[model samples]
Target: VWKDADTTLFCASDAKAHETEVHNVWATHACVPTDPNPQEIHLENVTENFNMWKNNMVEQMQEDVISLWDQSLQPCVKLTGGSVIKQACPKISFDPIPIHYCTPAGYVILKCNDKNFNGTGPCKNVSSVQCTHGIKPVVSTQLLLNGSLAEEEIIIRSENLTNNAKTIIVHLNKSVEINCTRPSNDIRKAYCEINGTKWNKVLKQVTEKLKEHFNNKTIIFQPPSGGDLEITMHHFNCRGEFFYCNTTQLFNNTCIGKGCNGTITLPCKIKQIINMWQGTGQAMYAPPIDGKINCVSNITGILLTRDGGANNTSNETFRPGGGNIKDNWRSELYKYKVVQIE
Candidate 1:
């Protein structure tokens, strides 16, 4: 797809020309539909070097992370015309995708497998099945009258019976993705940074062992003790499923849930400091000790962050998707999705 000031050219690979210069060859121009913002530069650089606009096709393809803002919220992507995306990063390369990729009900392209492409949205209870990664189970969200998913952030709260100083809080988004496609494709090698716990540093060693296993199946490995993992709820309304966490331990720690008051066993292992939001360790997989899943109302299949919950002595409590927080039920799920630019 070549374009110039005069005409656009997409010649059939018909002519086998010479490697050196050939006869009857000319450089012409055309009005080609090209990516509007290719280089992501200021107006000055182009005028200074007019040749910068000579070819935008390659520049467009080189863009690492792009948002599907132009597309309507749907399960599968139908890239009929050339796709348009809001560019991220310097518009040059290696810009990190925002914590919320699909902001305000947008689309994210799924590299749909051959089998998955046949379907659209709203499948079934995708959680229980080892899926073909089908379209979706009609996006389990807080379906309000306005027809949109609500907002949610996951918070982990800690309380100690013996000491107040041993209490700490952890916040996070229900679902997250680390797009390591631009700078490099080494995202799988990334770590879930968590510090402290397991009586002593036993949890630390447990993280290393957990890493050995998580390297294969997923990047959603451990939940860190420190920092927030902020998540948006409406995301699942697009193309995603419910997120699951074993809340048996989370509810056990909440004094409001089982005990009369929030009485927790483990001391706050994480130091009392809220740092920048980084990834986490095994708390997602292991038991969230001394802390519990907060304010869970089974009204919807979403997880959200809140200042506190119902127990006044205090009310911050979480129930399993169904049964009591300490019960064997699956508990309310979190909405989740991941975009891979392989």
Candidate 2:
């Protein structure tokens, strides 16, 4: 389920990604980088006695079962032979913390209860302003019933808290209609799952591809994945009315090749792309915005945003997603020559 082209291409961007030991670990399980400022882009964490190594890592990063790790990595720990669950901290604390100011992207965590709530079952994300007074962007979904669209919506209200109270309404739905240009609260496409085996195939390829992208300088953060935070793979076959994406960028301005497609890649962690300027403010977002957005790194290219940020702002966004990649120093590449479905 963790396979994606964005992951494939960016793998080589780090220096330490070349190590065989690190690549194997990255290929298989979901991992969180323990030391924010490690020796290289990646340290491989390839000590032979890995279990013991992890214990030492904990010593370095935290004190016990967890600390900052709990906020992102270890939110819930199963207890008593899988009986009840225990959260590292309370609800508000363990949540995905937003960046200092109102930035479009930030890191997300497993806030919802892992266990099913009886038969009624499971939970999802918290409200937008829960972490900060920012936008909690939503992906609009519509069911295709006999070629007709049926929409499911949750009303989003942007209200003022003053005497002369006024309210501005915005739909919390799909980013855009795949074909014609229509306004939307958010954006998404009709994607279909390709079973576990196919998913793993792409996962392995994505894992292997990371080795090639190693640049030996920049750090890498694999979006936290496990329990309820598992990343899924959904594909859309593009034959008609299909469009490629572009993002506002800051990283590689010279267009010297590689880095940010100018089409932001939000992926599953796209939810973290908040509408910071929901009320009113100039849009501002920057790529590789570390704690703010979990999956921004998964996709290539920062956005050509109004604020030139790769993250979300007060935008009716449709393209902070996987971007059309151009690998090598002097070459342009697309899964399809014209940015069609992969």
Q: For each candidate in the order shown, give its overall lDDT on alpha carbons.
A: 0.19, 0.19
Q: Model 1 segments beyond 4 Å from truth?
A: 1-92, 96-190, 197-314, 318-342
TM-score of model 2 relative to the true fold? 0.18
lDDT tens string, model 1, 60-107? 212211112111112222222355323221111111111111201121
Query: RMSD in angstroms, all models?
Result: 24.4, 25.4
Instruction: Rate residue 212 of model 2 by lDDT.
Output: 32
lDDT of 2 at 11: 12
| Tens digit per residue, CA lDDT, model 2, 1-342 | 111111111111121333433222232233222233322111132211111111211121122112222222222333333364555422221112111111112221111221211111223321111111111111111111011111233121112212112221212222212221212233432222112332223223322332232222221222212212111121111211111111122122223213322332322222222221112212112112223211110111111111123543332211111111111100101001000123
